[PDB]
Amino acid sequence: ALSAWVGYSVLGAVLDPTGKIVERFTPEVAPISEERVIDVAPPSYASRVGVREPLITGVRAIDGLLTCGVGQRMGIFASAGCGKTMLMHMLIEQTEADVFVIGLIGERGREVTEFVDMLRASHKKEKCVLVFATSDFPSVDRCNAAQLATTVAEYFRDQGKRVVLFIDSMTRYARALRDVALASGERPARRGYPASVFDNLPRLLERPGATSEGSITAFYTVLLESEEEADPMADEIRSILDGHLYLSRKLAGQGHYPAIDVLKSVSRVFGQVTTPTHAEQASAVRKLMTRLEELQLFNIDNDRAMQMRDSLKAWLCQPVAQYSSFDDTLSGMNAFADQNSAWSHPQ
Ligand SMILES: Nc1ncnc2c1ncn2[C@@H]1O[C@H](COP(=O)(O)OP(=O)(O)OP(O)(O)=S)[C@@H](O)[C@H]1O
Ligand SMILES: [Mg+2]
Numbered sequence: 166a167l168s169a170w171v172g173y174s175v176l177g178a179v180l181d182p183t184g185k186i187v188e189r190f191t192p193e194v195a196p197i198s199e200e201r202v203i204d205v206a207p208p209s210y211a212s213r214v215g216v217r218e219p220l221i222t223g224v225r226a227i228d229g230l231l232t233c234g235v236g237q238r239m240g241i242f243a244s245a246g247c248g249k250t251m252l253m254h255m256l257i258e259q260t261e262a263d264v265f266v267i268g269l270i271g272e273r274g275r276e277v278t279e280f281v282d283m284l285r286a287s288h289k290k291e292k293c294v295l296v297f298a299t300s301d302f303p304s305v306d307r308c309n310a311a312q313l314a315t316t317v318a319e320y321f322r323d324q325g326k327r328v329v330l331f332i333d334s335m336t337r338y339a340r341a342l343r344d345v346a347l348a349s350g351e352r353p354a355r356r357g358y359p360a361s362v363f364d365n366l367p368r369l370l371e372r373p374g375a376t377s378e379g380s381i382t383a384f385y386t387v388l389l390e391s392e393e394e395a396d397p398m399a400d401e402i403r404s405i406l407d408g409h410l411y412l413s414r415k416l417a418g419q420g421h422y423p424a425i426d427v428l429k430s431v432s433r434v435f436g437q438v439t440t441p442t443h444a445e446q447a448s449a450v451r452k453l454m455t456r457l458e459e460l461q462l463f464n465i466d467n468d469r470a471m472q473m474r475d476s477l478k479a480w481l482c483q484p485v486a487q488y489s490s491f492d493d494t495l496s497g498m499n500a501f502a503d504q505n506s507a508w509s510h511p512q
């Protein structure tokens with residue numbers, strides 16, 4: 166029952182896995198803090214509310230085709246070098262919320278330093294709390310890092326705030342759970358992961374969500390560690406979450422950022438967070454996308470098809486510093502849906 170001090174005193178601060186403020190980039194907002202246990206259970210399913218509103222991320226692809234809900238839990242699935250951390254930075258930059266909580270689990274110390282430098286550059290400095298653990302820490306503290314980030318998010322949610330929590334990565338948190346379980350007598354069950362791991366991923370992953378007070382919307386990064394190897398964890402985490410964003414290294418090599426493969430992504434809350442007009446426009450654009458990709462890798466029909474493909478790829482491509490209001494995103498959605506209605510038809 167390890168506890169830690171959380172609250173307004175950690176705003177604009179960097180916390181080590183035990184809640185010690187090791188750095189600030191903002192004068193302390195206020196000296197208000199509770200003691201809280203960092204590993205508690207999710208709230209009762211019957212105390213939840215529905216994922217109603219959308220969360221406007223300012224990213225066109227997400228807000229248009231994969232709209233997130235306030236209280237949703239979303240995964241960011243990618244192999245190496247596809248831009249998970251950069252997508253996190255863009256989401257922090259362009260999303261509107263009261264508090265942003267980031268949990269860096271088991272990265273190099275220099276990566277922690279680079280993230281904190283980016284955090285210092287931003288205009289939302291006073292709204293952010295970073296909790297970190299490097300690979301040099303024991304696995305216990307790597308688990309405590311994510312648990313503590315979740316606890317900070319929960320504090321500010323109980324204050325009635327819209328919180329956005331990030332965990333980079335859930336792959337490393339799962340491996341740290343595995344190592345702590347193994348190094349205490351527990352036996353492996355599936356791909357060397359002890360059984361308790363599978364009971365302890367949702368325990369953490371089901372803590373975010375909306376309540377009668379405020380809300381926590383959560384993004385978790387998952388590594389697609391190699392083909393045809395061990396990925397029981399990627400699939401299990403996919404199971405636990407309310408959707409996922411897949412980043413293809415195909416698009417990443419082109420420089421098409423964010424490297425979101427829309428056809429491989431889904432927001433399982435899209436139906437209840439979007440208007441019916443938006444929903445049918447999004448279905449039209451998804452039909453158009455899949456119809457175009459059916460051709461891609463194979464006269465004037467093909468001219469129109471591929472120039473439309475270029476237009477769509479350009480509309481999806483968007484730099485980190487660039488922000489798109491929901492209105493602008495929706496009008497672009499309407500235009501491409503129009504392009505599905507009046508279509509060239511090469512078959
Ligand atoms: N959206 C983006 N915009 C611009 N460059 C990007 C973007 N995403 C990735 N990059 C490039 O990729 C580099 C690092 O990408 P990352 O965001 O770290 O991907 P990653 O999957 O998080 O890597 P890991 O954590 O080591 S597996 C950046 O320094 C850029 O050169
Ligand atoms: Mg990363």
Ligand SMILES: [Mg+2]
Pocket residue numbers: 356395396397398399
């Ligand atoms: Mg695995």
